[PDB]
Amino acid sequence: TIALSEIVSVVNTSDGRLEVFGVGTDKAVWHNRQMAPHTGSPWSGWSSLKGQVTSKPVVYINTDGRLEVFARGTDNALWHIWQTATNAGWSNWQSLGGVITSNPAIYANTDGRLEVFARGADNALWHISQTTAHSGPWSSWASLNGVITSNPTVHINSDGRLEVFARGTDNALWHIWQTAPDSNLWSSWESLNGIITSDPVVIDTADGRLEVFARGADNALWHIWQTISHSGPWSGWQSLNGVITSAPAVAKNCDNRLEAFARGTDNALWHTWQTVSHSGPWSSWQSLNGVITSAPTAVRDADGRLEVFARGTDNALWLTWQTASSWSPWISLGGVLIDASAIK
Amino acid sequence: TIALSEIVSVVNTSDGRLEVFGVGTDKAVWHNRQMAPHTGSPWSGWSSLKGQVTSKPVVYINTDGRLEVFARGTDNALWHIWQTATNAGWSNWQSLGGVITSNPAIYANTDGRLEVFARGADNALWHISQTTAHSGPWSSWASLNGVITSNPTVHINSDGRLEVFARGTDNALWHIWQTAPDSNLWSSWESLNGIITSDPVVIDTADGRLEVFARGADNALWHIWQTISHSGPWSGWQSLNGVITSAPAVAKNCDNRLEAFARGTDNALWHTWQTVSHSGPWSSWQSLNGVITSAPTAVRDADGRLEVFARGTDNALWLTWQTASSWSPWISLGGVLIDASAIK
Ligand SMILES: COC[C@H]1O[C@@H](O)[C@H](O)[C@@H](OC)[C@@H]1O
């Protein structure tokens, strides 16, 4: 099992609007977007992209600005749907085949080719990629092996090498990396040790280091980071304390200070942030209230403010954001969302 | 002729350090970099990359994080030098041949291939590109025609199409764009009218629109923007007032508010900024003091603060940056820099 998942995928679009993707009771993918590129913009409301999915739907932005959404289908294949033009209309759902047993994880190679990572029936990590920048057709499926028990997460190093993170059968954090940008050549799997009870979250720091956050065996938030830009050795695990009842979400303030969000024991949203600078010590955990039934999802908007989404007790998506002094009261974006995570 | 040029090229590197490139009295390219990814970091001091150049040296970051510097040689060919590894050592200077009559202008295509633009002996716009992502070999040279009387500037649209801007023989702003990302297919040249007396500066707004700044016939700062994301029609010219005696420089605050810098009639650095938000009205012009002998060069650092470089009366490079309340007093980074601009 893993800590309670994020309920939506969010992106800050090429025209600076937040757009959220979730799963309805009907197992279709629904999306909601800001009208305007500003904190507190009015929202479209929920509209259906249809499909029938059995994973979290995961949006990624192509290097040409076109959104593309990846999800496991009811047939256990990887499916996708994409904008035919930047912030315009959508394709039909198309199958990329395979059989997958996790949420997909996506990143652009330095050459503009999306690469998708997902667990297989064998609990190994599999991958498939665009054969040309921001376009089909796609490569054959292949395996990067391992034995994983969490959803995988991918990020790019500051030298353009993709790196993937996942929990192992021993409940340690494991990782594997490209040996060169855009490559089909990967490292061996390596253990970063620890005992983790959530999906891992990966972010690039202002100084080009990967930093991974995960819930610990004690339900505290832990983190570990590359000690040199795009390189090991890693720091070894450090606790950020708290007692959290969901997966964490992490985003960068516009001054690059990291901020972590998670559900607390009182079912409120809690957060901890770097103080002073992106090199600064972490704050005490503080409450942002709400009563939430999912992990929070955090994103920086076009005004450089953090916005956080979470499911409420009514199964609506609710939203709070940074103000000059504080955070805004929770508002409802409505909808009825399910946790469709392929791993729970 | 054109307004007095920027003296350096600056980048925020893949490990969040500012690195500045200039030309010495010896016509070699010199560089200076922050030790640490923070406002007020100590600097390396000036070190030589050698070469013998007759343009502003222009640094660009490859999609794999490797810096690459482009300059016209004393032989009037395009030359370049690149990091062999991300924030590591440098190649030898290599010729990309051709004959050019402007500073080079560089952007990455969505597929990771750098494309370089420079004026020819015929005063047409010429271009050359990497044949593969972040690597040689390079394409043949070819012309995009036109007749230009300023250094060209290139930016990518929010839909991944490169667009180039330059002053025409009629002193209007002209532009030309790719018809598709990564394409060799371009539009016809189109006039945006106006009368401009500086190189144009181009920036992408938070909402995915190109906005161009240039000095006017009245030595005021003017600007014009795409009215729709990655699309015409354009806004038509609007004055931001001031009386400026250098080219302008523009950067984005970490909340995406645009800020323009230029030398004033008193030879001090002056600036004007968007107030409230990236959609907000522009401030009155205010002084940041100094006595400068170049256009300013503006960049946002890893702490989300603007830093501005300018040549002093002693021909040293000086530096001021945003503080909580104000701006820091000018400090000297030393060196002896010349304006090597291929167009003055
Ligand atoms: C990232 O996991 C950190 C874990 O490190 C382990 O070595 C500790 O025994 C354990 O403490 C209960 C932590 O959860």
Ligand SMILES: COC[C@H]1O[C@@H](O)[C@H](O)[C@@H](OC)[C@@H]1O
């Ligand atoms: C973020 O959740 C907002 C919640 O606010 C709570 O105070 C309400 O009782 C409850 O009302 C349905 C909401 O779910």
Ligand SMILES: COC[C@H]1O[C@@H](O)[C@H](O)[C@@H](OC)[C@@H]1O
């Ligand atoms: C994201 O919300 C989608 C839901 O919208 C609701 O308004 C519908 O009643 C419901 O259809 C049964 C959908 O699941």
Ligand SMILES: COC[C@H]1O[C@@H](O)[C@H](O)[C@@H](OC)[C@@H]1O
């Ligand atoms: C961008 O140039 C704006 C120019 O627009 C011209 O139409 C004006 O006559 C002229 O006013 C003196 C401005 O410099």
Ligand SMILES: COC[C@H]1O[C@@H](O)[C@H](O)[C@@H](OC)[C@@H]1O
């Ligand atoms: C940015 O320029 C700083 C200048 O400050 C001036 O106040 C000094 O007189 C002068 O001293 C050499 C410097 O060039």
Ligand SMILES: COC[C@H]1O[C@@H](O)[C@H](O)[C@@H](OC)[C@@H]1O
């Ligand atoms: C960027 O500064 C480079 C200059 O460094 C100076 O210290 C040297 O005297 C001078 O060599 C004649 C260089 O041009």
Ligand SMILES: [Cl-]
């Ligand atoms: Cl668990």
Ligand SMILES: [Cl-]
């Ligand atoms: Cl002039």
Ligand code: NA
């Ligand atoms: Na954006």
Ligand code: NA
């Ligand atoms: Na905060």
Ligand code: NA
């Ligand atoms: Na950077």
Ligand code: NA
């Ligand atoms: Na300012």
